[PDB]
Every structure is written in C-alpha cells, then in structure tokens.
Symmetry: D3
Subunit: 161 residues, 6 copies
C-alpha cells in the first residue's frame, strides 16, 4: 500500500491561505481569502513531488483534529479531486493517515461520504469567486488508482532533477 509524507500548509477551518516557499521551506501567508469560506480539510502538498503543473502535488488530509502549518503527516491516498484552474492542472490527492487502524475502512473514493466530497468540491469551485481573472473548470472526483498513478509519475519527475 502506497504512503507518503504530506506537509500540511493549511489547517481545516482556516481562511488564511498559507504556502511554503519550496526554495527555503519557509511558511508564507499567500492571502486572506476574499470569500467567506474556510478550508474544509487540512491541506498541503506531498514532499518530493513535481506535479503535472510543475509545482509539488497538492493533498487533502482527513484528520480527527487539525494540525499546525508546516507539520508532516504520513498519509495514504484514497482518491483525487481532478481540476484545472487559471494555473492549468491543479489536482488534489485525498488522503487519510497511514498506519492508523481507525481509517482502515476508508480504502477508496466510495468509502468517503458524498456530503464530504461535495463540501470539498464546493470549496474549490467557489473560493476564488471574488478574485477576478481566476476561474476553475473541469472539477471531478476520481478513484484511488488514478491518485496512485499521479503520485507515482510526480515522484519520478522529482527524481529526474
């Protein structure tokens, strides 16, 4: 079973959008969101990846309690939120904590309730609504196999460097 380290940038419940400078590893405030919205899960990126858009591959991690920005979480994928924004491809791997038996019933995208998946989708569809020249189109859920392959190829691209 695949697993990897996610650096969490943004705790669940946050309207401050934090990024990491990937040169330094410093956490940065990107912006306070222009919409009255809050990240619906802990959000970050997979360490040692180069995604389909030239940045590290983004990840959403389901947690019982949020963490702080910059914290590492060992995670395994169960699906992916596929999307294109003004930046091009901007896919998000849905994960759960690896090696934690309390998540053993969550193996694939169909094991995550529709209410959670719709909520996550709603966030990404709408959070940029009041920023002009920023859209999102092609927004879909895909299964674990598709998530694994995208992580796989983004690990290879990182190594080719």
């Amino acid at each position: 079973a695949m697993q990897f380290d996610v650096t969490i940038e943004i705790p669940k419940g946050q309207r401050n959008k934090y990024e990491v400078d990937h040169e330094t590893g410093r956490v940065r405030l990107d912006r306070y969101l222009y919409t009255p919205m809050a990240y619906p899960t802990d959000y970050g990126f997979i360490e040692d990846t180069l995604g389909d858009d030239g940045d590290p591959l983004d990840a959403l991690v389901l947690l019982p309690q949020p963490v702080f920005p910059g914290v590492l979480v060992a995670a395994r994928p169960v699906g992916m939120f596929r999307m294109v924004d003004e930046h091009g491809g901007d896919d998000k791997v849905l994960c759960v904590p690896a090696g934690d038996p309390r998540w053993d019933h969550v193996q694939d995208i169909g094991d995550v309730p529709a209410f959670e998946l719709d909520a996550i989708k709603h966030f990404f569809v709408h959070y940029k609504d009041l920023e002009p020249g920023k859209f999102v189109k092609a927004a879909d859920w895909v299964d674990r196999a598709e998530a694994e392959a995208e992580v796989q190829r983004s690990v290879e691209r990182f190594k080719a460097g």
Copy 2:
C-alpha cells in the same frame, strides 16, 4: 440617531448555525452548514421586532472581536442586505456598535468597503448551495434610510400584539 439591541446568535467565523427559540429565549443548534463556509460577521436579530416575514428582523453586526451566542449588543444601522429566500423575505440589517466613537466614520452603506459587502453577499448567496429546495434570489444592498424604515415598521408590528 436610531439604536437598538441585537441578540447575537452566531459569532463571526462559525459554521454552526445557531438560532434562538423565541418562546423560551433558549439558544439552539439549527445545523452545521453543508457548505465549507463561515458566517462573515456576527449575526443575530433585533429584540422586540416582527419583520416582513413574521420572524424577528435579522441583523449583521460589525465588531472588532466576535462575541458568544446569546449576547446583547446595542447597535445602530448603516444599511441593509435585502433578500428573498425559500422562506420569502429575509432581510438583514447591517449595524455597528452604538455609542462607540471608533465607528463614527461609518454612517451609511457607502462607508463600508465593497470587499466586505461582496463577502457578506457571497455568504448568503452560496451557503445553502448543497441543501436542496433552498434557493436565494433578489439579493441587494440598500442604504441606511431603507434599513431604518424596515426596523421602524417591525417595531410597530411587534407592539401591535
């Protein structure tokens, strides 16, 4: 200058939607929102009102720091968010704290930045997006005079009882 007491039900930043039972005065959890959204201001209702829809008149209060549910705040109106939902009329009076000189520059709807007003509007336009058979249409900002008249007539309707 008009002023009144607002009972705050929902602090700013909250995804739990609290109501008051107006028979008892008890605070109740209505629901946890189905959208990844958070109340953009402290939200409640004006005491001793009967609004255009038969409930107390709703109010949004701009505060430097949120309060707890059930707290009274003496407030004065500066504008109103006019809207119709599945319940019919569901207008919200925009207020600031009364008798507080730090808010003396905020007198009318044009004294509130567009970014705040758009954010508030976005909340009310979208927070019910994942609840079926719940829409909102006719969503507009109106000035202080219109707010005063609606409070005025809702105070009179309460007294006629």
Copy 3:
C-alpha cells in the same frame, strides 16, 4: 423515530465539568477535572426527563463541531452507555443530530466504530481516578432499543410530577 432535545452542558475537548442547576436553568462550573482528560463528545442531558437515579437522563451527542454550554440540540438515540457510579445508576444515551441526513447511516450501536465507543468508555472509567470515594463499576454498551425504553420511562416519570 424517536427524537428529543438535549441541553449540552460540556463541549467535546473540555476539562471543565459544567452542570445545569435544574431549579434555575443556570450553567454552573462543577469542577475542573483532577485527571488529564477531556470530554470525548459533547455531553449534556435530555430536557423533560427524570432518569433511573432521580436526575435528568444524561446524553452524549456526536457532532461535527462542538457547541457552547447551554445550547439545545434536537437528537435521536442510537445506543446507551450503561453504568453505575458512587451515585448509583448513571447511564448515558448516545445520540446523533435528528433530521440531519449526514447521520442517516448511524442507526444503532453497531454503526458507531469501536474506537469511539472504547474512547468514551475509557473516559468514564478513568476520569474520577484521582477523586477518592468515587468509583465506577458495571460499564457496558447497549443498543438503541434499550436506550429508547430508558428515555421513554424517564419521560413518563417527569410527567408524573
């Protein structure tokens, strides 16, 4: 399907043990726990009940986000934690929010993961460990039917008054 109002006294995560004075309805700090423990769910009591011990019947409510003390939550039972302490019978009805489709898959005690139920049990087994002359014995989970009957008879006892 049975439902009722729970007044939440103690949010999940709390080490302050709050009670309600049932004469007045005032919230009171009973004590700060003597153990390094925290209420594992939102905790309160069912309004209009007289339990098997002469106090209102206690309830645990599973919520996506905790509420504040004194808030009402409409809830339905899915099981019960049966126990006897130094006070005699001190049973706790396990509930979920009523009329909320996100909880429709949780119908009976077997629909709640063992890790949650063990955690709840551990709290009640151990939280009084450093208070002398306070024990708990006979600690067991029972199903929804048993919970319904105990609520039923505690509603009747309240009415006979």
Copy 4:
C-alpha cells in the same frame, strides 16, 4: 468558612468587556476595550449582593482554566482589591473555587504571589487610560477579613429590599 456564587461575566484573556443586565439576567457586550489589555483573571459579580456603590459586588476568581460568560462558580474570598473610579467605590473581591482542595493552601492575600497581585492591579490602573473622563485612584490590596465584611454588608443590603 464563607462561600458564595459568582456569576462570571468575563473570562481571563478577554478584551471584550461583558456585563449582565441585572433586571433580565441577559449578558451584554459593554465595549471592546480601548487599551491593548486583557482581563487578567475571570471577572464577575457575587449573586445577591448590593455593594457600597449600589451595584452587585465585583469578584475576581482565580481558575485553572477560564469559563464562559454567565457561568456560576461557587467561590470563597481570600482578599480584596479596594479602589475608587469615576463611578465612586468599585472594589473587587479576590476568590478561589470553594470546596476544591487544590486551593486549600490559598487562604489569605499573602498566599497569592505578588506578581499576580501586581498584574491585576496594573490592569485596573491602566485599562481605562484611553477613555477620557475615566480615572482610577486609591488602589490597594486588603486582606480576607476586610473582604468578608464587605460581602457580609452587601448581602444584608440586598436582603433589605
């Protein structure tokens, strides 16, 4: 040993100054402080008192963890902060939780460290510095006996009504 109920209005760490309407028992936001200061202890008033200034007698309660506004705490006095402000006499009884053995070593004003007492004094000396026509003079610590007598006489004044 004397004890009484304190209704806490303001948790420790707060810059929102909450009051209770003593007619209704409703919690109200008085104001957000004009100084960058925060209440150094949980702050409220003793129920069923009429102090030397015609309001209920104010109390400071030392707690391991703050409570919410409107919560009752059974407390016993260990000293008093004597002061006169623009309102005249505005004394504050220093208390600890009653019937709690973890506070048994705190019996009188000399059992409270000077750093706490200086901090409390500093708050009350300075929190109104940026509100014009509001001063405080005559600010002193006095012992438990003086605190008891002031509670005593304020209970009698309440009863004479």
Copy 5:
C-alpha cells in the same frame, strides 16, 4: 512602491513574547509578559535588515486575521513608531499586506485611525511597567517617508556584511 518580507514572531492577542534566534532561525519563547497586556497587532521583523540598534528592524503588520509565529508576510510600510528603550533605538515599522487591494486606501500614517495608533503606543509605553530597569522614552509616530528611509538604510547595513 517599497515592499519586503516580514517574519511574524507574535500573533495579535498574545501575551507570550516570541523571538527568533537569528543565527539558527529557531523561534524562542522570550517570556510571558509581566503585564496583563496583549500584542495589539501581529509583530515581527523585516528579513535581511540590520536596524539602527544592531538587530533586525521590527515591524507591526495590520492583518484581518493573525498568523502563526515564523510565518512570512510580504508587506509595505505606511509609517513608523519611533522609540528608545533600555536597549537604545527600538523603532517599529507599521505595515499592511503588499499586493492586496483591500489595503489600497491605507497609504500613509494619517490613513490609520487614531484609536489604533494610540492603542499600539499604549502597549509599547506600558508592557514593561512591571519589569524593573526597563523603561521606554521618546515614543512617537512618523510618516511613511521616514519609515522607507529607515528600512532603506537597514537593508544597506545588512548587505555591508
């Protein structure tokens, strides 16, 4: 228009005074303040500066929501709080987030309300009141031009190294 990176050490609302070790970049707890006061804005220092006192130049950043210690914020100056303490010169650049149109109306020190500026001043005037052998004198607000020049010369001093 000038801009720079501020490393925030202390979120707004905090009574823990955090510093950065500039050798390592580690965040350190300097002390819990001896006064019942709380940092009135997010507080840190400008990266790649050597101020008039041989430490990095301090900055206050006005934010809609505080950040965590160690977070970078791209900021632009609008004024400066000029002061001398027991350490000699200890000036603080007042900033707002750079490239954020919600702050475009805040260009110079006169665009910041007097109530904020007085509050900030009150903090720095009083927070060391209960630490002996620590004073502050010469405390004044100066405009953006003066702030720019001090940043300018502190950047040059850093480069000469």
Copy 6:
C-alpha cells in the same frame, strides 16, 4: 544552577501527539491519541541530548500559557518522572522557565503540588491504554539532583559523537 533549551513538541491541552524528526528538525504528527486524554503540560525534549534509551531526553515544562510546537524554551530542572515503557527507559525531566523570578519558589520536586504530579503521572500511566502491546511500568517521581545527573550524562553522550 543548570539550564538548557527545551524544544516543545506538544502544547498542554493537546490530543495530537507531535514529534520532531531529529535528522531534519521537521515537526511530525505521530498520532491522534486513542484515549480521551490531553497532555497535562507542555512536552518536548532537551536539545543536544542522548538519553538512556538512545533518543533525546524528554522534558515537561510548566508554563503560564502554552507555546506552539517547535518553539525553544530555556528551562531549568526541578525533578524527573522516571518510567519504563515498551521502548525501555522513557524518563521525563520536569522543568520551569529559567531566569524567570515568578518561578523562583519552585526549586525541587516537593515545591510542585501533589495534584499536578499525580495528574502528570495519570497521563503517562493511562494514555496508551487502548494501544495493544504498549504498557508502562515502574513509574515514579525523583528529585532535582537525579534529574541533573541524567541531563548531565545525556549531554556527555551527545558530545561523544
């Protein structure tokens, strides 16, 4: 008087167990505890130590207000919690902030109230109760001298490397 730097991993009140990767210095989420328990003090490790078990020496730091994970605190020891777990020796040095006169009355293990020491012990005795193949035996408090010697020898072991 001995002092040292503690890197705090876990703030007081936390049910998320954070660790540091000692290779990188990155903070990691180890796990969310399986018990309804919360760290009773701020918890971390002494920098530049190699304890009796081959990891850095663990420390508990008594603070007036918790810090964030990864923050350094200069501390001095007053005692130690001696224990063996499934990992072998897993001792914890009890500390207070160094160079802070508010802690000058806390010099040795007998200056810490029994209620705190029992609470800390209860945490470590019970927090792994629902993780199988994880026990703790031999759990005792020892005085400052014993703490100093263990730090001493763990500093020497770090240097021999």
